[PDB]
Symmetry: D2
Subunit: 502 residues, 4 copies
């Protein structure tokens, strides 16, 4: 007996036990006499069209692949539940938080950002930590990262950021000039670049990392009072990171390290958990916060905004079929039940549009009817009809226009969004020259020790050495603005690497 | 109270009765506070992206349409059953025929051929009469027409035939030159053109027409003995046709005449039935038949090949949702359970390829999992996985390769196809100059009376008058070869029409 | 010789003249020996897979259909130019208006709203009048109707409105209960319902109708000063309408009446033109306008806001291939060059999202590279890459992220949008009970004469008679609020129809 | 200055030189004022829908990914030419071979088989070596491998073979049980497994490997005389292989090793070439060949069937855009000009269907109009019309049905396929127990030396050690049947590995 992952097929055979093999059918349920040989004109003759077993099978094989996610393509999934352990109903009327001990089923997908489907798990990247909560008020998708911040604060830069992180459009090679040209020109990236090149840039699998919603959200209570919050889901297995050397070894030996680690943990009963916290900021505190509290390059310091515990995430179930439950799962940040709403974080606003839009391409118009995406603890009743691969009854003969005089579904005024007044012109406001260094300096000085600062600078220099000198210069200038020792330590390592380079 | 079709919504409201209206949700099951107004910056300001209710709804609306069927776009559907009334188990081991009184659920779609989705029902065209039998050996699709024959005997001509019958590629107008240039150049069309322009060219709705499989199929019994057969499903409501004048009136007044007629019949308990017959021809009779018995332009005369009764088709249920059950239904002639097989009819061979192929485009790779297409009285177990809009479990963790040592599904040797030897070179054989007139003459002389011959010639002349003279000449030449009176009567009417034409 | 439309193929043959027929090829340019017969095992044997001519052809045929437009499916197209005849550069810096006599190529598609692809042209409906201007500042799509107003003033009602106008979801029949339940519940529809049921509800083909942008747009001049405008394009062939009786006759005799009329006009040199006007309203006039000037159910009266002439639209070219140039053409109201911008008309704001969204489904992600949609008088240079059916070079090896240090395309600050301040909370504002009758009364009393009022009431009663009495009552109540004689005349006709009804 | 691949962007900037940056446009060619910031309601307000720059860009980004190839996903491409150096016009009338020194442009894609898009180049796998020849008789796709043979001889096993080589359907991990269960049950795989686990299982990039057509094809000369042939394209750079240790290192250090190697070779003028040979076998030799000459698990020994030189393949051009020219390129083995035809190799027959079928899914119906796939040295003229993303003119107003009387394209009887008679029943013939060992033994004994046999057995044992013992036993049994020393050496290494395993 090996690890449970290695024994998947042996275990499947054992569960079947005395059961006779199912009859092998075509897609249309017609039994197949022989699937090992095609119909030919005698033993050395050509293949006949009336071999429909062959064509049925081959035509399906020809269509197996769907587009990979534009980002976060390489992932691992698992199922479990969220349990409420504390009352936050003062902040949010959301049914998911309704009472202590209320259990909600969840689905999680962990991912890297830039790698395609066949890429290695144990690489330096932000990790995605997406959680789908199947509530009675519909699905809530908290599409988090393993970092509280991001590289950019305006969503129109997102495609450019991802392009710079992916392959050269001509050579199809990863390109340090592209990576560092973009970051050196957009110094709002320094905070997340500091996190990325620190030890938590390569977690030891998915169980040993935190998740964050990253954005400011808005909680609304039963009295219609709103606060702003951040969501934090801190690992109960403890933070653990791979060394650059072990990460490199594993990238070759076990490209699927994270998938295997998580599958084996859950298969052997070692159910990974995370403690779910919020930070709360009142609308008055948002007016007086030293930065933009809706700026995705900024945290809320823990002294001013302590973590309020809410509940626990537990993953206790592996997917039965990876394609059905992990490849096809879709998280939309716009899937927010009543009591949880978007802040005006510009990055969150962009994500409200982009995810349903990419889901309709990647999966199809009716992707919310794929079982893993279905809000199966809610009744879907609306005026939406048809579209390709329409499953179930398409809401039967129910009236398909609103308003109507025939008793079809009705708006629920309690589900109405929280209203705010906003001051200013409708236009494009520059946020490039918001504060790019203050919190990065707090991280470098107050959070990292001396050993950690040395590895941070070694990890950066090792990547940045491959960029052109003009890019190295602009990158080091930005690091120097954080702290002279940050910049100078990087420049010192670059001088060594650029000298070795013929 | 009006006809049941007109009262669809009133009846839906009545069934709901005391029930409170369902809560109006987004696709992800999140309740909607207000679906009558969008979120704006004050009462005369611009629309906000965070109006995801608006975007969810509008994005679905934007994707409602799927491609129409390349042919037979305009249709009416209904459900019911096939009941065996006689034993043909001597001819076929097919479970659908297994014992007297065995009931199998069916789905039927009636259609015209050339009209697009918004076109009129009461036009001159062949009608499609497609029957899906949900058997325990998987689905059997008998994709029949309201005529025993077709216009062509080689499938490589099918796209050309349909192009000639549809719109001019530049003007987007129906084009008599295209229609009659093609038919006049391909005189194998005379038999089906004679049927088309006779009284049965415009049935009085779907209940008053026969269906035919048209092709020769092969029945195989439990001893592995094969015969050839034709399938005939003769209306129990009796043949009834619209006059050209009534057909024209209805095309304007009731474009959906056939849909309405069928829906109202079933809603008022007038359940239309058809008697299901076979004709049988032994392999020896196939050697000695005066024509090619696999030629789709030929019938088997009833004196030599009498109708053997088998069962009854009954339609007793309307679709609950037209899009879900009629627009999305897919019939594949290649869906044949054991005991029923393709003959070497070249046209049937082409159809073995074309239908699954168009279904994967029109509906999607996984179109067999759409509920109306699902073989729900059979267990589908095979090595096919994934593809877009993968529903159910994608066969869970079952081994996905064959052969395997882990107890996944197994071929069933009893389901093996019937073997035949064929004589000749593998090449393209010309069938253009097979007999194009003998059976057409039998129809003109022995089956039509004098009144019927007059209307046949008036219906043809009225269409053919719009073609160029050179096409009229070639068309009349072919009609003359059937019978001098056929040709001369048409030429006489054309002389009258061409004289009136300035 | 017949009409030019009827002679399309004869004319094509004549242009070819002495030229030998092209060699018939597969899709991959391989010459075809025989396309009239398939490869079989001898003359009565089965079809071979190695017949790739057959499969290449059939597989293409299987994929011919794309989804029809969700609305405005049935259309006619033509090409020509817009010519400036007056200076409006005081109002707009748009290059399309730059100097007198400046010619810009245009594409136009005329359509009905509710009919599917095979439906009749000569039916009561609004007509679409979409104009694409191929300018040097990219395409400008003015996606107009043959009416200055619409049935609704909030875009979240659009899918419901279109559902109510299309087929019952169960029966697939047009449903007067659905049509009149929706209109009777949404009396903002009265203005466009009055226009719809008047004589201009059935134009005599496309050449004899006006087009309107319908929405308020914003013009911005070279000094950055903004006004609001309406666009009007008045027929130079004069308004002409079909009688209900002639419209009904033509629906049967010539379903493609509008396509044929337009094709024949342009083929015979009778080039239809429209005079292009604007109405202008200053930002101060917008503050003091008695209604919401951004309300799509309201006109700007001509006395207060006279038509300022701008130029002339001329259609002088037929499409060479209908599918390539009319079926595949896509108009996005969001395609606005500098000098032309969206007003805060809520309906226009909805249309900014919906059209690119439906285009990516109906045509594909890269639909702007389809030749008729390509901005071929502008250089497209940006950071967009890849997507299915990527044509041209995908911008070669150009840097694919912004900002960059490598000289790839740069933002043009002169192309920056006009900034405005808006007052109020971000929320859903009810507009149902805005004024629904004032301008409708002006139309009934001041614009229609006595004969026209009689036909208006006869046309409404003839449709509304089929709705349930409770709907008839609510409909008549709303008509009565416009004018007692409007309501009473309709009720009188209904009493007659409801008495005849058993 | 670095390697040319690293300098892609610097070189692009240099070519631009004094040229001003292009203006940044939307997809519709409208200039963009600012692409660095979105439109918001004041500086901390929500995002507006009328930010169409944002939506245009984001919507395109959302749709960038197309499905990866179902197999051979990870690839490198290049362009060049084929030059004829010898006369084989006695064997083939194909224009590509017409006269000595005739140059034909080519496109090549090199690939591994099982890896997804982000996987490492330097792994043990067969390599794809696909060549597209743009001839005047249309495209010829020679879709070859770096091995003359394959693992299976019946195409209905292909999906199972690829499934066994890819990820476990539940765990999404590579599974040695799946790999070796399949191979141990299908011992026809021994020949290609022996090649795979030998030194040529990991070439040193694409320039240092041979290509083979693998299948028997049929050459037909101007007199209509047919022979059978194999195509061989032997590297002029010489065979060179990575050691397992270097391959493992490079998999981590340079996942894109093969892409980089090839791009840098061509960028520095080191244009890789291959010598193109045929082996010829007459129809009489095919009758008397000791094996099935159409069996893809068998070679034609060089002594009996010497290599006849034909020409040279040269790659002298890199792709300008990888997505446009390498990701979107499609090779169909069915794209064969006159003079080259399919043999009855069952595997080739399956490939005649599968490639156009997967291309219509992966790329779209009109994938042959993507510039890299276009037969641009041939005139495409046929009766195929429409389909999504129809580019060019869709053949204008040409008649769209065949036959016609209007001078549209005509079949070319010289392009007719070669006719053969075949003996036997139309049925499924078992080929599992064809000879599985004779040629494998010739390889083990006569072609490998002692050092090579040792590495062969070490490479197999290192993979097979991870399979269950029952699979190891069945695998070793099959190796023993090749040669007792083959089996025993593997069993010896397994005993060592299975002892180390706790």
């Amino acid at each position: 007996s090996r690890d449970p992952a290695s024994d998947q097929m042996q275990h499947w055979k054992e569960q079947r036990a005395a059961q006779k093999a199912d009859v092998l059918t075509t897609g249309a349920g017609n039994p197949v006499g022989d699937k090992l040989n095609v119909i030919t004109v005698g033993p050395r003759g050509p293949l006949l069209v009336q071999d429909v077993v062959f064509t049925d099978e081959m035509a399906h094989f020809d269509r197996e692949r769907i587009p990979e996610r534009v980002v976060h393509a390489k992932g691992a999934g698992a199922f479990g539940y969220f349990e409420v352990t504390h009352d936050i109903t003062k902040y949010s009327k959301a049914k998911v938080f309704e009472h202590i001990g209320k259990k909600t089923p969840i689905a999680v997908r962990f991912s890297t950002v830039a790698g395609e489907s066949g890429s290695a798990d144990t690489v330096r990247d932000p990790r995605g930590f997406a959680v789908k909560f199947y509530t009675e008020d519909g699905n809530w998708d908290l599409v988090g990262n393993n970092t509280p911040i991001f590289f950019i604060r305006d969503p129109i830069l997102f495609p450019s950021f991802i392009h710079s992180q992916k392959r050269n459009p001509q050579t199809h090679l990863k390109d340090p000039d592209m990576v560092w040209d973009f970051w050196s020109l957009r110094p709002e990236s320094l905070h997340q670049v500091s996190f990325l090149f620190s030890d938590r840039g390569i977690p030891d699998g998915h169980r040993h990392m935190n998740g964050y919603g990253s954005h400011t959200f808005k909680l609304v209570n039963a009295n219609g009072e709103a606060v702003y919050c951040k969501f934090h889901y801190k690992t109960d297995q403890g933070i653990k990171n791979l060394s650059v050397e072990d990460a490199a070894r594993l990238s070759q030996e076990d490209p699927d390290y994270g998938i295997r680690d998580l599958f084996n943990a859950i298969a052997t009963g070692k159910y990974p958990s995370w403690t779910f916290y919020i930070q709360v900021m009142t609308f008055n505190q948002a007016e007086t916060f030293p930065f933009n509290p809706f700026d995705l390059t900024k945290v809320w310091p823990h002294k001013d905004y302590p973590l309020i515990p809410v509940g626990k995430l537990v993953l206790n179930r592996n997917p039965v079929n990876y394609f059905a439950e992990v490849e096809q799962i879709a998280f939309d940040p716009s899937n927010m039940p009543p009591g949880i709403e978007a802040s005006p974080d510009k990055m969150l606003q962009g994500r409200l549009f982009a995810y349903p839009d990419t889901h309709r391409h990647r999966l199809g118009p009716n992707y919310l009817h794929i079982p893993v995406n279905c809000p199966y603890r809610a009744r879907v009743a609306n005026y939406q009809r048809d579209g390709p691969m329409c499953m179930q009854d398409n809401q039967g003969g129910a009236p398909n226009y609103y308003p109507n005089s025939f008793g079809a579904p009705e708006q629920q005024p309690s589900a109405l969004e929280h209203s705010i007044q906003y001051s200013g012109e409708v236009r494009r406001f520059n946020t490039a020259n918001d504060d790019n260094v203050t919190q990065v300096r707090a991280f470098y000085v107050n959070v990292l020790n001396e050993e950690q600062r040395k590895r941070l600078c070694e990890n950066i220099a090792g990547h940045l050495k491959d960029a052109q000198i003009f890019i190295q210069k602009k990158a080091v200038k930005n690091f120097t603005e954080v702290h002279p020792d940050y910049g100078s330590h990087i420049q010192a390592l670059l001088d060594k690497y650029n000298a070795e380079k013929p």
